[PDB]
């Protein structure tokens, strides 16, 4: 079974997810999944074709478990890990505002998404975070956007130049 | 005084600017490098009630024509086969642009702080909903009254099978809503609409009339009457941020990126639309493009915004140099991959080749002969067991997908751009076709992770992908897509399965 | 020329014959129904559905999407164009919602246009008929101009609360309904100003300037908590569903309905004011229209979701509690307005009864739908504390 | 088939070629304006005038007629299809009249259709909003059901008064306006019943049957003189102009405007009734619309006729006096209804204020137009003597 | 608190009770019948729903016209002959729609039952819509067509010609002058049910064949309203079927109504179809038989049998006189072309073959005459020849029936050639058939319409034309023409130079 919308990888993960019946275990697995399979900094591209769909299924499980374990106030203001959402947002924004360059800034923003994307952090705080973190990242990235020659940019990004044609 | 009195829109609008009030958290919820001025005004002094009336009047005329006279004239049928197919793509792809523009202007409405500027974007929000439903109606009408409903009736799901759809989403979906609100406004309004959409919409109605299609002119001409307000929104976006120090630092960069993004896809796809998607021609794309992008937009329109620090996109020259053969190079690929579409394609006929060669010297020696070869191989015949892809395999001409624009390119065969950059980053391979998109990726890796068709379909047999994504007619056997536009000898799923073509990721050959 | 220069394929002999010759003998497929693959909500697929469902290019990783793969271009940082991360609510399919009134753009602007032209006719008839003569001057210059006028900012704020939703909605059917709920709110705010402008034309000395109503809204007491609630709903809520749900199924359903229906619609008549009720009729019609859509989305589709019913109700129950307190505060401050009225206009019993009508309607139409345990007398007593 | 068997000359290659070949190089006349010979009332000829003026085939012996000769077929006896003998009024041209609102059929049904649909939407919102909860039961079950309902027979009777005029009108512009005045009248009557049918649906024991309101109209005392005047304006007048003038410039302008505006529109709101005013809003919007047309015809055209100015004013002054008495009587009888209202609903100081509004508005819009000298005090006094 | 409302039927349910009894509650119009005050109507409508259903139709219609049709230049790409034909068809129908307003207003007054009054009332409003629709057709062709003259002023230029008189008898006076019931039979039972209803659709058929998409758009919309009028006509007979006067007078009023209507339409409609077009749809003789004989005369009238209605006794007579009627009339219409407000064309070769194929003997009579006139130069202003001169030269008097106003030429006609001339109290009267003769003999005062020869006597042709504005914008060229080409148009001078003077043909019997 190798379909686009339905396949063995997806079925397998649906089972792994059906076995998460505790918020701490499920939330930890979601965060681990994001470190392993999302963003250009993912530990591996083996799940490239299904990680988006699988992540959603894992999110569904974490949300359901969090709503059942948390009282109303914590559901609104605490991350699935028990952290105060506002504190995390403010601390991350502070780190972002102190970022020395665009390279540090991108690590902060991307890392924040991998660690706190919604089922983890309440949506309100998370999107407030997107608002502030994204602003600074762009401000640093778009300044003198074309000054660095491609030859040197490839080096800064740290890609392995496999082939060039012109 | 007991005389008949009332109140009009302008009279209420006079006080709309004062509707917004100050409070600590009264600020946009979206990330942005720019600051839209608090006192920005809007050109059209509309209120909800009057907006609805002026659009209602337009709908009446439009739907009246469609349901009555045009239906009585069998206007849905009496259109050239090639154009009936072209409209499946033009109307549905445009539909997604209209739709995302809804979210796009909702985001700009959120960004604007002056009530009048918010109100201006609001009108566009409602207009793009109207346009979404209008484009939907065109496919709806052709499906119900045309010579071939397949594709017109399910494009929303059958468009997902092909690679041309990916590029459309970049410029007309994601490009409209993902990024700095201002960057989005440039892709949508200052570039998208002002440069391509406004002129394109009228051109389509002319090419449509030429091919016997009076349905599209009826709808698209109505859509066009709304665009003036959107041009004004794009213009006001620039005005609203012009006096902010950030503007001098970032405006031209976002504008240059937006320009390259839009043209990268439309330069080759539109020319493919007009020249290869019609029997009767109206004008050569080469000249049409230079007049639109260079003179009209890149000269006059952009020039008017020079007083706000707006400069001509630095990538304009590269765009022009790459433009000449772009659409010819791409149709070779679209036709070669015909089984992945939701429309029927036809090879240039004898008469057409003369035009191409006449308008593009050197066309025949390259594309002409190739097409002649494919037809000789039996590309139009189901019993041949041949699809142009095979020819690419046999001649070792790999087709790559630009990681950023999603535009397919075959550098070893193109007469236009032949550049190819292949990078490896953290376990993943990436292929680029130009220096502008490469920079975008190098600087913004996490913005461009779109899986291409080869990556997703890798190891899959062609007919399997087609069947899984419902690329079949109601008989459950005949393919929606076809390599010819005739009514007989239509390829079936079995005809493709027998070819046993399997997808492979071209980038894996690199070590 | 009389015939023109451009030749058309449908009517030009030479071109049409070329066209006709290339045509097939019959359609290449007998399924002439666009959207045939969409599961109909009703007996047969409606035009509303065919023209709307699946217009949004979502991939399958966003519940109900038919596309595949990641977006082509995302925000700096990686945020997807649209994603599950923009709302706490979950569902098996974001495309299940259906506006019970089946409103796509054409029917929507058609009805609003009818209301516009009839409104103009009414005003011209009202002015020519001199019906203004019998309207109590104080009610007119004090309550209509200042207090009804200040309410325009409330509606304007609720309109703006919809901006983020217009951008983040996870489906076409929800985006369209959402856009129309918001557009009706800005319309109402503009109708309030329209009335003030009309009054300034037939009543010597009446100032249509918004300075007074705006000062009342921004610095008065009657609407203080109402404004604080609106500022929060609009700008402190980053979840598009929390916004639409809390605005329509909590704040506007309680505060909005009380102000529009139990204060102005109820008392204006007693002062010879048939003018304001004409506009409030539009506002209430709009309120009841939106309610059907709001109920279908949050109760029929999300609150009763086959897989996330329990989860979604827990969350909405949470949002109701979060916003019920500020809503009660808003109503409580508004009670201060009754002391401003001419003696004998109304009394504590009428005020209380009207509060219970709004609260009882709310329990029935909204709260009960998610099992929220509302205590009607507790809510009313908290509000009545605001009576001076 | 896909193409159909019928060939159409606009799209069929063969047929279209023939048509195209027979076409002239350019239009055979540059004057592409239909009705160009009609004298514009305003700056430029309006679509309303072009499509309406001179549709009636009158010959020159009917002031304004452009045709010639007698009719082709007449009534047994010799009465002409249309003729000067069907009305006392005279003019230099019956086609002078112009509806200030310029309503031909299309605009007319467009506006009424908008009102119908918004009305349905309003009722749907009102019921869903539970607004009926704040309406006074007695005002609803007694004054709206019985007395407002009875008034539908009044408006219905005024509607029917237009039948003969629909047949005798001497010009297209006058026939169209007349038809629309009468059609709006039955619409109102139907809206009154509509409201009672609406109440019946949302108020459990409410009976929509016209039994009660009809008996009130046919036997009651409150509308006795009202019904008598209506029966006369309708079946006793054989002059289409006396009918139209007497109904819109005398009776309905006085009695009608008082009942609709000064009674139900003024008092209903006090009983928590925003429902009835919703429909009365239409009746008044309609009244004010018709008024502009009635004024243009009988005053701008006839009353100010370049040749029969004095003559017509005399006839209209005569008519004004003739029906002013039956109208005064109608108002008097109606005054009895106040005594049936609950204590504290209103005082004589208020009613007197409303009566003077009706009269002063009348003299302002109608009476002073034909130089009819009416005494506001004597009229108000005679009517006010019915409480 | 469920959303609730009230529809048309729910109000209409109580409409019958709207009317109440009282002394003079009776019709103001003379009539021999009594319409039962318990009569019902088929469609349960109220003013507001009526307005909505018509508004929706208007929407589509005006939408097509203003948009797609105008972009297609539909007002222009029509055969010249049809452009001319619509000047007559639309304007002549317009008067029928207009008088139908007054007629139904009179029937509304006649009906005593509120529902029956309501039925007629709906038609009163429909006929107003149709008046404006036919007006709009001419207005549109005037605005965007190949020849606005006539389309732009038919309301006054139609008074010049004789054919307009006959139109007024069937679509104006016949609709409103006489017993309310007689009028109803002329308009609804006969006019609409037998002719109008079928006619309107056939017209859209001939229009389509000739490139005209404007008329189908408008006329097909008009057609959607006719079911209500058929019902009114039918209910008219049901309303009086119980009154004893019915068994004594109905069938006579019906017969007279039938003869009246067919007398004009049999010749005139066939003329407009076969001679006012290039492309043909169907031979009029075939159409007529199906329409008048089968559908109406048989199927439709048959359903009214139980109400004591019998097929007109003059039916056989009508069928006999019908065969050549339209062919005979066009000769006169063309011979008198200068009195029209439209341009005429003689049959081309293809048409003559079509006429001969469908009407054996056509060429030897009409065909040869047309070729004779054309060779003589009837189409060329320099020839100094107008076909009327040929009638004079060959002693073929043209008379106007005193009753129907239909022109007839007994000595030349291939159809009916009966002629009766009488003198009464110093006045001469010419009749073309026994039915019209009886009508006049019994009701002399109902028919005193002066004919064109009586009014124009002694006047020079160009003088009548000039006085009645039969000219184009240049003030010199005639609106009417003996050909449909764009060159060599006749001018007032081309006519004046001939010195044709009108004479009263009946005086020859003095
Ligand atoms: Br493949
Ligand atoms: Br003569
Ligand atoms: Fe658009
Ligand atoms: Fe746009
Ligand atoms: Fe008609
Ligand atoms: Fe009719």
UniProtKB/Swiss-Prot annotation, chain A:
Gene name per UniProt: mmoZ
Job description of the protein: Responsible for the initial oxygenation of methane to methanol in methanotrophs. It also catalyzes the monohydroxylation of a variety of unactivated alkenes, alicyclic, aromatic and heterocyclic compounds.
SUPFAM superfamilies in the record: Methane monooxygenase hydrolase, gamma subunit (SSF47152)
Assembly, per entry: M.capsulatus has two forms of methane monooxygenase, a soluble and a membrane-bound type. The soluble type consists of four components (A to D): protein A, comprising three chains, in an alpha-2, beta-2, gamma-2 configuration, is a nonheme iron protein containing an unusual mu-hydroxo bridge structure at its active site and interacts with both oxygen and methane.
Keywords: Monooxygenase, NADP, One-carbon metabolism, Oxidoreductase
Entry keyword annotation includes Nucleotide-binding: no
Catalytic activity: methane + NADH + O2 + H(+) = methanol + NAD(+) + H2O; methane + NADPH + O2 + H(+) = methanol + NADP(+) + H2O
Keyword NADP among record annotations: yes
Gene3D superfamilies in the record: Methane monooxygenase, gamma chain, domain 1, Methane monooxygenase, gamma chain, domain 2
E.C. numbers: 1.14.13.25
Entry protein name: Methane monooxygenase component A gamma chain
GO molecular function terms attached to this record: methane monooxygenase [NAD(P)H] activity
Record-level GO BP terms: methane metabolic process; one-carbon metabolic process
Source species, domain of life: Bacteria
InterPro entries, per database record: Me_mOase_g, Me_mOase_g_dom1, Me_mOase_g_dom2, Me_mOase_sf_g, MethMoxGammaMmoZ
Organism: Methylococcus capsulatus (strain ATCC 33009 / NCIMB 11132 / Bath)
Curated annotation (Swiss-Prot), chain B:
UniProt keyword NADP present: yes
Keyword tags: Iron, Metal-binding, Monooxygenase, NADP, One-carbon metabolism, Oxidoreductase
SUPFAM superfamilies, per the entry: Ferritin-like (SSF47240)
Active site positions, chain numbering: 135
GO biological process terms on file: one-carbon metabolic process
UniProt-listed Enzyme Commission number(s): 1.14.13.25
Presence of keyword Cytoplasm: no
Amino acids binding Fe cation 2: 193, 227, 230
A GO MF label: metal ion binding
Cofactor note: Binds 2 iron ions.
Residue sites binding Fe cation 1 per the record: 98, 128, 131
The family this protein is said to belong to: Belongs to the TmoA/XamoA family.
Assembly with partners or alone: M.capsulatus has two forms of methane monooxygenase, a soluble and a membrane-bound type. The soluble type consists of four components (A to D): protein A, comprising three chains, in an alpha-2, beta-2, gamma-2 configuration, is a nonheme iron protein containing an unusual mu-hydroxo bridge structure at its active site and interacts with both oxygen and methane.
Protein name listed in UniProt: Methane monooxygenase component A alpha chain
Species: Methylococcus capsulatus (strain ATCC 33009 / NCIMB 11132 / Bath)
Organism classification: Bacteria, Pseudomonadati, Pseudomonadota, Gammaproteobacteria, Methylococcales
Gene giving rise to this polypeptide: mmoX
UniProtKB/Swiss-Prot annotation, chain D:
Reaction catalysis annotation: methane + NADH + O2 + H(+) = methanol + NAD(+) + H2O; methane + NADPH + O2 + H(+) = methanol + NADP(+) + H2O
Xref: InterPro entries: Ferritin-like_SF (IPR009078), MethMoxA_beta (IPR054956), MP_mOase_hydro (IPR012078), Phenol_Hydrox (IPR003430), RNR-like (IPR012348)
Gene Ontology biological process: one-carbon metabolic process
Keywords, sorted A to Z: Monooxygenase, NADP, One-carbon metabolism, Oxidoreductase
GO molecular function, one term: methane monooxygenase [NAD(P)H] activity
Signal peptide stretch: none
Annotated disulfide bonds: none
The protein's Enzyme Commission number: 1.14.13.25
Source organism superkingdom: Bacteria
Function of the protein: Responsible for the initial oxygenation of methane to methanol in methanotrophs. It also catalyzes the monohydroxylation of a variety of unactivated alkenes, alicyclic, aromatic and heterocyclic compounds.
Complex and partners: M.capsulatus has two forms of methane monooxygenase, a soluble and a membrane-bound type. The soluble type consists of four components (A to D): protein A, comprising three chains, in an alpha-2, beta-2, gamma-2 configuration, is a nonheme iron protein containing an unusual mu-hydroxo bridge structure at its active site and interacts with both oxygen and methane.
Protein name: Methane monooxygenase component A beta chain
Organism: Methylococcus capsulatus (strain ATCC 33009 / NCIMB 11132 / Bath)
């Amino acid at each position: 079974k190798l379909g686009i919308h339905s396949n063995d990888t997806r079925d397998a993960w649906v089972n792994k997810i059906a076995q998460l019946n505790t918020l701490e275990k499920a939330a930890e697995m979601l965060k681990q999944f994001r470190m392993d399979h999302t963003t250009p900094f993912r530990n591996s591209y083996e799940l490239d074709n299904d990680y988006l769909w699988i992540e959603a299924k894992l999110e569904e499980k974490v949300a359901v478990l969090k709503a059942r374990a948390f009282n109303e106030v914590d559901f609104r203001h605490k991350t699935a890990f028990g952290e105060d959402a506002k504190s995390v947002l403010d601390g991350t924004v502070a780190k972002m505002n102190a970022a020395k360059d665009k390279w540090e800034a991108e690590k902060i923003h991307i890392g924040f998404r991998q660690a706190y994307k919604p089922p983890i952090m309440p949506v309100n705080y998370f999107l407030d975070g997107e608002r502030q973190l994204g602003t600074r990242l762009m401000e640093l990235r778009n300044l003198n956007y074309y000054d660095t020659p491609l030859e040197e940019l490839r080096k800064q990004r740290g890609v392995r130049v496999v082939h060039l044609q012109s | 005084n007991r005389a008949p009195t009332s109140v009009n829109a302008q009279e209420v609008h006079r006080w709309l600017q004062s509707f917004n009030w100050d409070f600590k958290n009264n600020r946009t919820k979206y990330a942005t490098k720019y600051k839209m001025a608090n006192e920005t005004k809007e050109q059209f002094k509309l209120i909800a009630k009057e907006y609805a009336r002026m659009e209602a009047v337009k709908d009446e005329r439009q739907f009246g024509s469609l349901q009555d006279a045009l239906t009585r004239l069998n206007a849905g049928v009496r259109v050239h086969p090639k154009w009936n197919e072209t409209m499946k793509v033009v109307s549905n792809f445009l539909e997604v642009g209209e739709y995302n523009a809804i979210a796009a202007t909702g985001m700009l409405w959120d960004s604007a702080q002056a009530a009048e500027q918010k109100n201006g974007y609001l009108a566009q929000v409602l207009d793009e909903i109207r346009h979404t439903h209008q484009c939907a109606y065109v496919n709806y009408y052709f499906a119900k009254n045309g010579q071939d409903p397949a594709g017109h009736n399910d494009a929303r799901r059958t468009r997902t099978i092909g690679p041309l759809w990916k590029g459309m989403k970049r410029v007309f979906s994601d490009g409209f809503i993902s990024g700095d609100a201002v960057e989005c406004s440039l892709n949508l309004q200052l570039v998208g609409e002002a440069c391509f959409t406004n002129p394109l919409i009228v051109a389509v109605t002319e090419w449509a009339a030429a091919n016997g299609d009076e349905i599209t002119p009826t709808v698209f001409l109505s859509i066009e009457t709304d665009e003036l307000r959107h041009m004004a929104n794009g213009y006001q976006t620039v005005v609203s941020i012009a006096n902010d120090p950030a503007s001098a630092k970032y405006l031209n960069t976002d504008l240059n990126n937006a320009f390259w993004t839009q043209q990268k896809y439309f330069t080759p796809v539109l020319g493919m639309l007009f020249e290869y998607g019609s029997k009767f021609k109206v004008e050569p794309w080469v000249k049409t493009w230079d007049r639109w992008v260079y003179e009209d937009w890149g000269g006059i329109w952009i020039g008017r915004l020079g007083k706000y620090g707006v400069e001509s996109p630095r990538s304009l020259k590269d765009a022009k140099q790459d433009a000449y053969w772009a659409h010819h190079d791409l149709y070779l690929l679209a036709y070669a991959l015909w089984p992945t579409g939701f429309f029927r394609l036809a090879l240039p006929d004898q008469e057409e080749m003369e035009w191409f060669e006449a308008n593009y010297p050197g066309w025949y020696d390259h594309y002409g002969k190739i097409y002649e070869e494919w037809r000789a191989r039996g590309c139009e015949d189901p019993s041949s067991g041949f699809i142009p892809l095979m020819w690419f395999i046999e001649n070792n001409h790999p087709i790559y997908i630009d990681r950023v624009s999603q535009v397919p390119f075959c550098p070893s065969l193109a007469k236009g751009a032949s550049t190819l950059r292949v990078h490896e980053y953290n376990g993943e391979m990436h292929t680029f076709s130009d220096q502008w998109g490469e920079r975008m990726w190098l600087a913004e890796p996490e913005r461009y992770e779109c899986q291409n068709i080869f990556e997703q379909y890798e190891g899959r047999e062609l007919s399997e992908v087609i069947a899984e994504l419902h690329g079949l007619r109601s008989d459950g056997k005949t393919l929606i897509a076809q390599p010819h536009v005739r009514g007989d000898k239509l390829w079936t799923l079995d005809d493709i399965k027998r070819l046993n073509c399997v997808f492979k990721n071209p980038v894996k050959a690199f070590n | 020329s009389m015939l023109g220069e451009r030749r058309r394929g449908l009517t030009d002999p030479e071109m049409a014959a070329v066209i006709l010759k290339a045509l097939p003998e019959a359609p290449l497929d007998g399924n002439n129904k666009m959207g045939y693959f969409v599961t109909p909500r009703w007996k047969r697929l409606t035009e509303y559905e065919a023209l709307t469902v699946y217009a949004q290019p979502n991939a399958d990783w966003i519940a109900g999407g038919l596309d595949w793969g990641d977006w082509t271009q995302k925000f700096h940082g990686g945020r997807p164009s649209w994603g599950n991360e923009t709302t706490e609510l979950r569902t098996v399919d974001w495309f299940k919602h259906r506006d019970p009134l089946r409103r796509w753009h054409a029917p929507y602007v058609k009805d609003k246009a009818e209301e516009w032209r009839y409104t103009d006719r009414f005003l011209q008839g009202y002015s020519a008929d001199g019906q203004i003569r019998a309207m109590n001057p104080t009610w007119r210059d004090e309550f209509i101009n200042r207090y009804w006028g200040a309410f325009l900012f409330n509606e304007y704020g609720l309109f703006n609360a919809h901006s983020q939703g217009a951008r983040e909605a996870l489906s076409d059917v929800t985006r369209v309904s959402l856009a129309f709920w918001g557009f009706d709110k800005i319309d109402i705010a503009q109708m309030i100003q329209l009335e003030r402008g009309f009054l300034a034309k037939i009543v010597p000395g009446f100032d249509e300037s918004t300075a007074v109503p705006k000062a009342e809204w921004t610095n008065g007491e009657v609407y203080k908590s109402a404004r604080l609630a609106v500022e929060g709903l609009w700008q402190e809520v980053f979840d598009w569903n929390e916004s639409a749900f809390s605005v329509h199924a909590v704040y506007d359903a309680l505060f909005g309905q009380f102000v529009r229906r139990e204060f102005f619609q109820r008392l204006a008549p007693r002062f010879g004011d048939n003018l304001t009720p004409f506009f409030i009729n539009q506002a209430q019609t709009y309120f009841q229209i939106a309610k059907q859509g709001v109920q279908d989305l949050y109760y029929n589709c999300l609150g009763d979701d086959p897989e996330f019913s329990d989860y979604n109700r827990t969350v909405m129950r949470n949002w109701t509690g979060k916003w019920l307190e500020p809503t009660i505060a808003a109503l409580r401050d508004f009670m201060g307005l009754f002391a401003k009225l001419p003696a004998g206009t109304t009394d504590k019993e009428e005020i209380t009864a009207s509060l219970y009508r709004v609260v009882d309607d709310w329990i029935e139409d909204y709260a009960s739908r998610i099992d929220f345990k509302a205590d009607r007398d507790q809510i009313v007593k908290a509000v009545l504390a605001g009576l001076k």
